[PDB]
Each structure stands twice: as C-alpha cells, then as structure tokens.
Point group: D3
C-alpha cells in the first residue's frame, strides 16, 4: 500500500491541550509514523471547555529540539494585530536556521477571537486579504537577507535585515478557504493549506492555486497542496459523536466565524449545535477503515499532505490507532511535494 513512504500529519490543537502534553504526543506521533506537525497559533480557545492557548512560537522551539518532525504554524496572521510581519519573518528565519529543512511558515488572514485583544479596527475579509498580501511582500523582502525598506498602505518598515538566516528560506504556506487568496497564494508563495470541505470547493481552491502559480511562471506540480481535517475517533461511534459535540462544537457551526470576539460567545452559540450539523464536516466513527477511506479520497483529489486533528481528548489512543491501522495503508504518490526548503 503505497508508491511513496508512509506518512501523515498531526494537528496540535493548542485550543484544547496543555503544551507539555502536545510535546509528548508529538514525540509519540513521530514514533508511530506521523512525519509533520501543524500547530495552531491562537491566543484564545473557541470555548472555555477547550480551555487552552499556548504561545506556539516558544513551543515550536521545543518540538524542533526534541524530534526530527517537520512542523509549521497553521496559521499565523502576520498583519499587525498580535504580530508584526517583520517579527514573523524573524521567527520563521530563526526556526529554519536551527532546524533546517523542517519548518514551514503558515500564514492567514486571522480571526477576531485572537486579534481583537489589541483593540483595533477589525476589517472585513477582503480588506484583510489586502493586508495579508502586503505582509507577504514584507516577509519576502526580509527573506532576501539584504537591508530592506517598505512603505505601503498597512505597514512601514525602516531599514531592516535578518542577520540570522538559513541557507535557503522556509516556504510560505497560505491557509485560506477563499478562491481569490488561493490564486494569490500560487502567485506569491510556495504552497496552499486549506480546511476540509466538499469535493467541489476543494477542487476550486486547488484549481485557483494552480492557475495562480502558472500565471506567475512557477511549476505547480512541485508546490505542496495541504489539507487540515477534523475527525473524531474513539472506541465506539457513540463516544466519537459525543466527543465532537462536547469538545469541538465550532465544527458544527457551518457559517463564517472570523468576526466573533469571545470564547463565551462561541460557547453560547454551541447550545444550538446538534450531531446532524457535523455531517460532511467532521467524520465521527470508530471504524478505522472508514478513516482510511476518507483520507485516501483527499490524496486522490490531489492533496500531497494531510494534517489530522482528532477532536477528542483521547489523543494518545488516537495516535496509536492511526499508527497501526491507518498510516501504513495510505497510498501517497512518490515524489509528491511537501512543505520544506
């Protein structure tokens, strides 16, 4: 079962788990055949019941120094609320310098849950895309390793340079579910990361990313196409359903969530969520064959990397279960591109 080596991605949910636990689980995931970690960049969890939000950048240093996994932010908003783009560039450059060939910088337009804390105007999605495109320009200038200046609508950078660089900069991955930003990702950056969705919408995002890259003279067959999915595995279908309902009610909220400020808001909205609202959106089953079929389908659509978030608190059992029953049976095309320098 597979032309290429066995591999899979593990989603580290900072929303839900203490960072000490996540470190231990990633070390275990490595042992069990996972090859890469996607790590959320939150300040707040969605709900109090999830109850965590570690500073990912400190944690990534620990992961880098204790595993040989690849790893990335999924995703950092470098648009000047929590984080100035110049600093994100330095962080990315430092991590890749220390852990060459292992880091990938995942960026996106952000959500108010996290960015509202600094008490600034929150622009509409389209405008935040414009801010993201400018941030990408800044990160890329800094990645050249020369002294650079920048003056655009949203950011001003005085004479700045990254003195600590890797020989080759880390790839910039854009996390987006928007067709416009997908095109811009292919045009401006190295790879795409998208959440799970129906086939039609995934195929549109891949398509836009590809035509953006070609339009800019790049070869999209050598550019990574990554997906993050939310699943619930447990010992029975019953515990799998309840796990999703209690731990990840935001997974049943089929509506835009980027304007909602507080965990307490999501928690109140969660009172509406029912098991039906998860179909198509979060796979809830104990049947590990069905997990494998779900994942294989995504590979077949043309994703070259998959990052899996189990929503239950049964993270250790989940990692071992996927290691034995799922990861070995996934067929990856050989020499598929992966987020790496």
């Amino acid at each position: 079962m597979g032309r290429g080596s066995s591999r899979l991605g593990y989603s580290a949910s900072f929303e839900q788990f203490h960072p000490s636990d996540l470190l231990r689980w990633c070390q275990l995931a490595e042992q069990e055949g996972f090859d890469s970690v996607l790590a959320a960049d939150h300040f707040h969890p969605w709900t109090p019941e999830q109850g965590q939000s570690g500073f990912v950048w400190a944690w990534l240093g620990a992961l880098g120094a204790t595993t040989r996994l690849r790893f990335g932010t999924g995703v950092t908003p470098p648009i000047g609320f929590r984080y100035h783009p110049a600093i994100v560039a330095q962080a990315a450059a430092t991590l890749e310098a220390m852990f060459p060939g292992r880091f990938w910088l995942g960026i996106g337009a952000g959500e108010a849950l996290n960015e509202h804390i600094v008490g600034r105007y929150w622009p509409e999605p389209a405008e935040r895309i414009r801010m993201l495109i400018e941030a990408i320009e800044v990160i890329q200038k800094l990645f050249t390793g020369k002294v650079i200046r920048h003056e655009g609508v949203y950011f001003k950078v005085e004479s700045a340079k990254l003195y600590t660089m890797p020989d080759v900069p880390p790839p910039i991955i854009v996390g987006t579910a928007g067709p416009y930003m997908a095109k811009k990702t292919g045009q401006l950056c190295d790879g795409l990361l998208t959440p799970g969705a129906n086939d039609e919408k995934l195929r549109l995002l891949l398509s836009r990313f590809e035509e953006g890259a070609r339009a800019a003279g790049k070869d999209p067959r050598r550019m990574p196409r990554m997906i993050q999915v939310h699943v619930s595995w447990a010992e029975t279908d019953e515990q799998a359903i309840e796990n999703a309902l209690r731990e990840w009610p935001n997974g049943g909220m089929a509506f835009p969530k980027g304007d909602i400020r507080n965990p307490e808001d999501f928690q109140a909205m969660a009172r509406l969520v029912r098991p039906e609202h998860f179909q198509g959106r979060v796979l809830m089953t104990s049947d590990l064959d069905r997990h494998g079929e779900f994942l294989q389908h995504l590979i077949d659509l043309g994703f070259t990397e998959i990052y899996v978030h189990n929503v239950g608190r049964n993270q250790e059992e989940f990692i071992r279960a996927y290691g034995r029953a799922v990861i070995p049976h996934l067929r990856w095309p050989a020499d598929a591109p992966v987020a790496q320098a």
Copy 2:
C-alpha cells in the same frame, strides 16, 4: 568555598552567535556549573561584524526542553513596537507552564536598534518608562488568569484571558540603570537586573530598589538583585583586548545608545573606539583569579545573581575555563533569592 551552592549565569549573546551554537554552549555551561541563562531579545546586532539576531522566544523553547537551567529574557521591551504586552504575557505564561520554576520574564524600555523597524514615533527614555509601567500593569492583569480589560494612555486590551498558565506566574524582572525605574521595580515587580557600573551607582540602584519595595510593603531581602557584566577572557591579555575591540566596540561607547537606529551606524562609530575606552567598563584579562575577584566584589555589593557575557568568540574555552577556575571559588550567601516563581 561558599555558604551556598556553586552557581553563575551565562549570557547568550544573540547579537554575535548563531542560535544553534548558543543552544550547544548553554548545554555545556550547564555541565560546567552555570545554573541560569540570560538571553538577549534583539532583532538587529549592534554591528554587522557581530552578525546575528535570532528570535529569542523560539530559542527559549529549545533551551527549556534540552536543559534544566533557569533562563530569562534580558530584556524584552513589551511596549508595542516589536511586541504588544498581551503577547509577551502569553509567551511568559506558556514558557513557565512548560518549564515550571525555571523562567523569569526580563523587561525594559527597549532600544531603537530593534524597535525602529516598525516605523513609529520613538519616545524619549522618560516617556518609554511611562509606557513600561503601563505594560507591567497589563502583564500583571493577564497573569491573574481572569478575563481582563485595560484602557490607559498607551495600550488598549479588549476582553482577554490566559487559559494556559502555570500554578504560579513567573517573576517579572526589570532591566534598568535608572534610579527612578529601580524604585518602581521594587514597588511593582519581583526583581531588578542592571548592567555593570561603578560601585557608587550600583549601590544607589540597589538602595532605590530596596526602598521602593519596602514602601509597597514587600520584603526586599527575598527579592532577586541581578547584574549583567561584559568580560573578555582569552589565552593572553593581548587576545583579550583585541577580542573586546573587534567583537564588542559598543562596550567602549560610554554614552546612551538607545536612539541609534542601524548596525551600520554603530559600525561607523566603532572606528573611534580604542582599548582605553573600556577601563572600568569591560574587564579584559587572561588572569582568571582577577575574573573571580571582579565577580566576588559584585556579590559583596549585594547582587544575588550574576550573568556573564564573554565578548570573544572563544565561547567554549571560556565556559570550560570559568567552570574549572572561577565558579567553584565564588562565595554566594546561602538562601540568597533567585529569579524563580
């Protein structure tokens, strides 16, 4: 000899050394009797000849996960240029949660070398102190672990909470050489960190810190008093002098440096610096006895922690030399307070 256990601090100079090297050297320093690491928070080095500036926050995660050392920023400016205070609080809380009893948050008013890159008005020292005091208020509110709001002159914080906390928050250490801020440090924070200076000026800072703490009802005898010094050790006096002159000319710049924007500026100013300009200010000698006497004197003034920066590139030889000849012979008072929760 000594009433308390043998110990000393190592300064990790991000200005000069690749972060991979610093990690290895800290691991070695642990083996050789150093107990704690002070880590610079820079974006730029002072000169191109120094030639580095890793993102400290990622590096600290690696240090935490691979040593048992105590460690701290020396120092982070949490005043909304590079870093918003809310984020510094999250970073500090995450580090201490992962490495309990090991992290201390060192903060200060910042220098333009690092903060100018975001292209905002750079206030005079006194005003930056006002900004620092407000930032301290924000960090402390977030450290309570409750949902907090803040609205002052410099910062606005919408409903925010740290979900990922240690049982006990890390100490806040203020890095300053100003009598006013020393008093405020004793009043508002947990400990003081100061650079090397003549006895009279050190005794004034200690004195102000103490009376600030008493005025606020605290016991200053249980609050850490920390100093950071720059030395040059090498095989001969000649190499020790040249090491300082080539690697750390800013050490011969007896003047306030916090308004100067570019490495290229310091480098041009360095052309003026001569060996004479270092006396009193950087100890330059191969005589390890004289190193020990210098350090012991500081202990006797009442410092409870010393962090030593060797300015030469001979970091490994320096660590081994101090481990054998210096650290074992330093007499620390027993039950002296140290930066720890």
Copy 3:
C-alpha cells in the same frame, strides 16, 4: 382605557405597508407604535430596512398614535447625537405629546457600514451615557458646547423645540444599563424574556431612579414582545421559524455584521429554541393572558410584534379578541410629555 402597542418591523415590511397597517391598528384600538431603526434586516428573507425618521413624519401626519424609535443608537456611527436630538425635537414639535425617543447601544448589523472601530458592549454603554448627556443639553434649548471622550459639540442650539421635550427611553436588556436608565433618563424599554430576568431589570431600573431621587412609579416601563399568531398552531410555529430565526438565537448578536451571516446561522435554529422567547399559538385567549401577565409584572406599555407576514389579519384579530380584554391600571405612566 383599552390600549396596546404595535411593533412596526422595518426588517420585514415595506414602509408603505407599515403606514397602512398602523392606520388600521389605530382603528382597531392600538394607541402607540414602536418603530425599528435599522439599516439592514437580520436576514435577506426578511428583506427590508426603511429609514425610520422619514417614515415617522408620515405616521405623525396621518394618525393620532403615539410613536417612538425602538431603538436609535446615537453614538456617532450612522447617527451623531446632535442630529438625533434635532430629529426628536422636530417630531415632538410637530406632533406634541406623541413622540418618545428610544435609544440604545446599537448592533454591528447596522453600524458597521461606516467602517469604524466597533467597541465592546461595556464601552458602547460609556458612549451611550455621553450621548445621553449631549441630547439632554440640546433639549434645554440653550446654546451648548460639549467635549468628552467620544463626542465634540461646537456651539449648537435647537431653534425648533416643543414646549416640553420628548422623554428619553433607553432600550436595554442589561442590569447595569437598566440602573443607569433609571438614574439618568425618563423610562425603560426591554425585550421579552423570562420573568426572572424581567423582574431583575425592573428592579434595577427602580432602584437606580430612587438612588437619584426620582419617583419610578411615574416613569414608563415598556416591553417589546415577539409573538406568532396565525390560523393554526402549525402556521404560527413555521411563521416564527422562517421569518424570525433571530428570535431563536439566545446569544449576543451585536458583533455580527451581515444579514448573510445571520441567514447562515439560522440553519441551526429549531422550534424548541423559541420557548419562553416567542409565543407561538392561534389561541387568542392565550395571547391575552400572556400580555395581561406582563402588565401585572409592572409594564405600563407593551409593544407587540407579530412575526408572521399576516399583519392585517393579526391586527384585526387582536382588535376583536385581545385589546378589549386587557386591564391597564389607571394613571399608569406612558411615554409622553
């Protein structure tokens, strides 16, 4: 005397229709109109949002009903407080004894269009309190200046005033703002809610007024309720579900910007989420008992929003079966000068 309030839902109905229905409601025993101040409806399915201030002039000139905004946010997004004051003063000058100015902290649905920083609820309360101070200064009829955190008013005066200014009614469901309403304003307007929460708001309003030396027994206490009447219980339930899903959203709604957002959230709403929150029944006796209960809690005015599109049938049904059977205490205070 027999009376009841009619809620004009600008979210749902063309303003020409609302005018005709208010004229009919007058004929059928309703005495007062509460009129929403929206720019956007909650959902596209509701599909309207007339400019209330123009419409109120038409209502004033063609009926003898009392009427009020429920509610205007005078905090400098859509509307500067100085202008709200002028509008209020003009309406009351033209229709003396008939207008009441209802104000509140606003929702992003309407205010986000001007593209400014949207503060948290508590901060918007601070803005509302400042706006109240501005409106009250202007209502004195003198030349006034104001300089606070949120608003600046250069030398300004209302030359067109009534002999007595219209009452300022605050629309809120928050205990803190209820107390401030009693302390600073003339009366309270609250949405329908369980008895425990209504009794707490009334209580806070009352003790706010007493703390400031006022007599709360002479200050109006107004409630707006959402009901669904139709020919059968079945159509009543479906009417609520299709036309007013926001009534099943028991959670803060003031940060959500777009109708399209509410419409997507509506997919979650179910009939169960309306109990206690929207009365859904064809039994007009049960409508009467529900309303009488609210009178007895101590509300002196009730404004009724039927959520169905069957507005004409609803008005006639209430006129025959409900309004004549409601017992109002004599000399209950009402929003008026």
Copy 4:
C-alpha cells in the same frame, strides 16, 4: 403657456415652524404650485429667523398629505451631519413610499450647519472632491446590490439598500460653481442653482450641458432648476422692510459657507441696507413685475423655479401668486422636471 401651469415653493426651515410649513405646502398645492424645495438646516442664519426643523422627518409628512413633488435643497452628504450611506437610505425610502415624487438635492454644505460636529472644515474645492466621492457612494447603493467603497474621504463596508423604488430618485446638485456644474451634468441627473445675473446663469447652464454631452447623455431631457428669493407684500414699503428684517443674508453679496454661528450673521446684518439687495432679491408689491422676473428665467432655459418669499406673510403670498402669477407663466411643453 404651451405646458401646464406650475411653480415651485421654497419651504424656509430657517424661518418657519414645520407645522406651519406643512399647512402652507398643502395650500400651495391647492393654488397651483407643483413642487417643494426644502432646506436642510440645523441652524437658521439669524436668531430672528428662529427655526430649523429636521427636514427628513418633515418630508415624510409632506409626502403622505400632498401629491406634490419635493426635494432637499440641499443636503450635504459628506459626513459631518450626515454620512452618504444614510442619505442614500433616506432618499430610497422616500421615493419607495412616494414614487415619482422625490428628488435628492445635494451640495457642498455650509459651516453654519456642519460645524456642530467639531471636525476640520475644508475649503470649497476640497468639499467638491468630497461631494464627488459621496455621489459615487449614493449611486453604488442605488444599484440595490451589496457594495463596498474605500476612497479618500469615505469607507463603506458591505452594505445594501433592501428598501428601494423600482427606479431610483434623481440626484440634483445644488451649486453656483462652473466646475461643479460640469461635473453635475457628467455624473448626476440635474442642476439646481441660485439666482444670479444672466451671464453667470448662462455659464452654469452651458457647463452643465457640455458636461452631460461629454458623458454621452442628452441634456435637453435633464432638469435645470433655479431657486430665487423674493419679497412680496401689500406695498413696496413692507416688501423692503420684510427683506431687511427677515432675510439680511440676502444682502450679503459674499461667500457665507465658513461662518459658524447665527450670532455671527446677526452681527453682520447690522451692515446690510436696502440697496445691497438690488439684482439679488426682488422687492415689490407689483405682481406683474414678479411674473416678468420669473418668465425671464424660464426664457434663459430653466425648466423649474422654486420661489422663496422672505416675508412672514406666507399664506397671502401663496394665494397672491396662485391668482396673479402662476397662471400667466409660459412653460415650454414637455420640459424636464426632477422626477423618475
């Protein structure tokens, strides 16, 4: 006349209680006036004038009790008193309720009204640039789709007018400036100008026309409207004193858009004398002479005239014009008018 008898009545919010204005407009309808121009003020020019109703509420009353056409003359939709998005909603609501009757008159505004919000007051040329941007915003909203806008002066997040008429109301620009007249023809539906000498009126008409042609429109089907101030009374003497006491700003032959307070105008009024009104305000009891004055303007090519009597004798004035003036005015047939 080739076309039906008609004339416009100016409702002076500066001077009269809005209840009175409503009654007088109802009377004006009865007497052959066909349209109302309504000032959008916050403050009167002088305390002696002593009023300033909120026009938008009043217009709802007018719409519901008459069959007259009516318009703002003029609203400044440039974000002092009024954000352009709100003006659009107001306009769309009025036309939805009173289809074929409303016209939205806009202009660059005066400090008398806008200074109350305590913001920087730009020079006329800059306020024109703000007006042009406001026009763009109103027109996008009038499309009835969800629209966004980001220009120098205004930001509009996702917004839509759900309550619209089948056809949007015309946008009329009130200006006396050659540049803005051209832009009005290019961008909007019709022109409104104050009284002035023939040469200056002919220049404004000319600029409006060539602006419209340059943009591919037919200016012969676009309204050309003028607002004039007259004083009619029982004798020449009362006509003169009425103007002097009630409308001294009519003798202030100088730009007035920077002056902030009624008390300022009132102090300046002490300078004004009867002589300063010649050319600028017709002051006579001779209704023939009123008719000749108005006919002249029709002949220059104005298709609508709005008349403000400055005296407090509004009822007598309306009846006098109804009997002696309006019936004798010769309007070209099928002349364009501010409407659907």
Copy 5:
C-alpha cells in the same frame, strides 16, 4: 506738559505697507518722540487693497539694529498653526538677547486669515484660549533656561533648552478683549494688550487683569497695561473718512472676524461698510487737538502705553503731525510700567 517724559507707540501695519517703508517710518517716528513699535504678525492682509504681509520676525531684527526703540509683536499666535510655541520662545529670547530691555513678546489666540494656510482644524475661541494657556506654559518653561519637557493636550516638547538667552527674559504680553483671558493674563503673564472699545468694557478688562495678578500674588502696579487704537488723521475730515473707508474697512466690521479665511472674503464684505459703522470704533478727524483728547482719555482710564495705527497711507505726514502737535502734550504718570524686562 506731563509728570513723565513724552512718549507714544507707533503701530507698524504689515497688512498695508512694504517692510522697507515701515523700517524708514519707525526710524522717523523715533526722531519724532515715539518710544516703541507694535508690529503685526500676519501672513495675509485683511484685503488685497492693503496688499502686504511681511514676516515680522526678520523685520524686527532690522528695527532692533537701527533704532533704540522698544518693540513687540502684536500679536503672535504660538499655538502650532504657523508657529510652534518652542520656536516663538527661541525667537523672543534671541531678540531680547541682542536688544536687551527692548523686546516684548505679544501673543494671542490668532485669526483664521493667517492660520488657515496649514489646513488644520480651526477651534472655537474658547478652545483656542485653552491652547494659548498651554503655549504660555511652554514658553515660560523654556524661558527658565533649563532643559525642559512638556506633554499636555495640545503640545509635546522633547528635551529642549534655550542656550541663547538674555539675563532677564522678555515680558509676555497677552492681546485679548475677553474678560476671562484678561484675568488669566494677570495670573500667568506680565502684561495686557487690548484693542479700543467703550470705557465700560476697557475698565472691566483692566479690572480683571489686575485682580488676576493679585490673586496669584503678583504686583499689578508694576505690570504694563497697553492699548492699540486705530485712527485716521489727514489734512481734512473728508480725506480722513475716505482713508478709513478704503484702507481699513475691517475697522467698520463690528463683529467677530477670527473665522474668515481669505482676503477676498473681507474685500467682498467691505462693500457693505459705510462711514457710520466707524463711530466709537475709529476716530476720523483732521483736528489734532481731538486726537490728543482721545489719547489722554485712554491714559486716564489707566493704560500705561498706547500704540497708534493711522489707517491712511499718509504715514510720514501723520508721524510728523503727532510729533509736533500730540506727543508733547500727552500727560503720562511718572514711572508708569512699560513692556520691558
């Protein structure tokens, strides 16, 4: 013909006259018994017909170096439109340093005619008073000759010092016709300058100034009380009237003028002005006895200095006429206070 020496002030109208002419006329005025010059600080004239506006600060250097007259601005608005208060302080200090005992700094709330050119929000009078009071605080701090900082609502001053100072700073004179600001002038400054007005209103201003000074512990008997008047002298009453009407129509504008932006605006308003509008407000007569009586009356009200602006272009004839017929016959109380260090 007087207890004290013969003296009078000459108003240099920059609105009307080329600065080369004004210099020559002041030199003549010195010869003819005038002792001091008041110099307007305009950017624009009131009307194009007046047709001038020299930069007063350059001109005052020429006056200082070629006469022995006292001189002052009447008045400079130091409120950050045309002029930042720190610069006004430097200008004042430099003039008094070069011409000790001769300069007095006259300040006021400004008019839009001059300040509108920089395109900033123009506040109402009362607010501009608040700005003036803050400016006064800044000028006074700088006048101490120490390194000073300031941070208030309207102005920010970083570490600043006047290195070039006189031994004693020049007096600050406030030009105002407002009872409130008159009181504040006595409380905060050194002297009052007011325009002509009826006796009742002048007596109120003097009275308020005096009680402001006493309330703040100062001695108002040693503080100058100065008035600026506009007169029209010519060979006949007819030319005197026409001179005023054509050259100074703003003198017949009995209304607040501080909001009007353009000369073209005043010029259009001037078409309304008639001879009658000047009574009480500008003395128009060829009878030099009547000029003397007018001026003596003001001395008797309690003014210690009078500055006379002849509105006609007949400046030379006016100076000679006053020198022969008026100045010698004015009775000044001996040792009356005068604007001087």
Copy 6:
C-alpha cells in the same frame, strides 16, 4: 574680484558677536554670510543657538553682504514650508539681490523638540522635494493650494514679494538629491569631501539641470568647509578638538537628539579623526591652497567656518593673507536673483 564667504556659527557664538564679526568680515573682503539654522548647539561647550531669521534682519540692515540660511529644514517640524517661503520673500524684498534660501533635510538635534516621528533620510528627502514644490508655488505670487503626502496648504499668497524671488539652494551630500537640486531648484550647497565625491555631486547637479532644460553653467555651486586657524599648529589642533568635536565624528549624525549625547560621544574624538575633514594649521598659504583647489574643482562660492573662538583674528588673518590671493573665474554665478 576678491571675495569669500564667512560661516556664522550660531552653535558657538552669541548673535551680538556674530553681527559685529560679520560687519568686520565685510571690511576685510568677505562678500557673503552663511548662517546656521539651529535650535540646539552640538555640545553645551559650544553653548549657543540664536533664531537665525531675526538675526538676518539685523545683518541685512547693517551690512551690504549677501547672506543665506545654511540650512533651513522646511519640512514641518520647527518650520512649515509656507512660513519659510514668507520669510525668504520678506528678506529679499527688504534686501534685494542679497538673500538666498538654503534648505535641507534637517537633523534631529533641532527638529526633535516638537515630539513627532523622525523619518529616515530617504523619506526626509521626499518631504524636502514636496516642501520645494510648496515654496515655489508661493514664490509665483499667485493664490495657491497644495495637497500632497506630507503638506496641505489652503488658499495662500505672498503679498510681500521682491520683483524677483530669491534662489533656492539645496544643502546635500547625496548624489540623488544633487540631481534633484539641479532639476527643481537654483543652486547646490555641499560640505567638504574628497575630490571624487565632490566631482560626482557637481556632475549629478549639472545633469539634473540639463535634463530639465536649464543651463548649469549659470547656476551657483557652493561649498561649506570647516577649518582651524590659530597662531600655531598646536592651538589650531586643540581649538578643533575642544570646540568642534563633531567635526571628528565621521558618521551620520542626523538621528542624535541631545547636545548631552554629542558631548558624551566627544570623549572618543582624537586629533587623528579630523584628517581629510578639518584643516588644522597656522600656515595661511596652506589655507589658501586648500580653498583655491575647491575653486578649481568648479565651486563658485566658498563659505569658511573657523572652529576656534579666535574669530576676529581669523577674519583679519584671512583678509590680509588669503582672500586677496584667491583666483575666482570672472562672471561666475553666485547665489543672488
């Protein structure tokens, strides 16, 4: 004819002294004065900073010298460009043919006092170019408006003008700004530097002017130098070291805010750091050869700053031994209308 420029160092000398020395310099063969526009001196030891604009009026009225600012930053810290234009126009109106307006990008030492963001050099160049546009519009003598990135000018006009406006001279050591100076302004002012760098600046200024259709051979090319003359080489060296340590600071100084900062940095400065940068000698022949060399490179004006406090002896010494022996090309252009 014999001529030379005198630099009036406001940083070091009381303005009363500078006036007297300029009057003497006129007597001794100097023809023009360059006057610093400072708020602060470099060091407390220098100890002065008169407001130059007032002083220039005194100079104008008591000498027949030409004079100019060297240089004013008209970029809206200390000085708004509209005001600089008025000042320039007034001076030239009073002293026709004598004033030249020297402008530049400014230093923080002077501009930081108003407590605004201090941009990097390149950005300050952009600000300077916009300021030049403003000054030039005002110099047309018509009513003008301006709206750019950095400045806004409402309807403004200079009513007091000379028949011909004063030349605008840009003080810069940057090749980019030199080209822009030739393109936009009337003349160049540069500090002393090696031949290669001076020849590049002249070259860039020339090709900027040609590109814009001007004749650069009729446009002034001015240089400002710092020298130390005294009775012996020893006193000349010590004078430079004690009075003008900033002359030994071979590094960009435009970001340093305080005199106290420069004073502390001065503790590093040694005699060696002045070679190439400040001529330190008692040999007046060597002074003459230094100056003649600059004339030969193609400078048409030289302004000399003696750094010692021996200003009177210096002026007399140059008058006798230097100025008479300098060979200037006839009909060389000079800063004048």
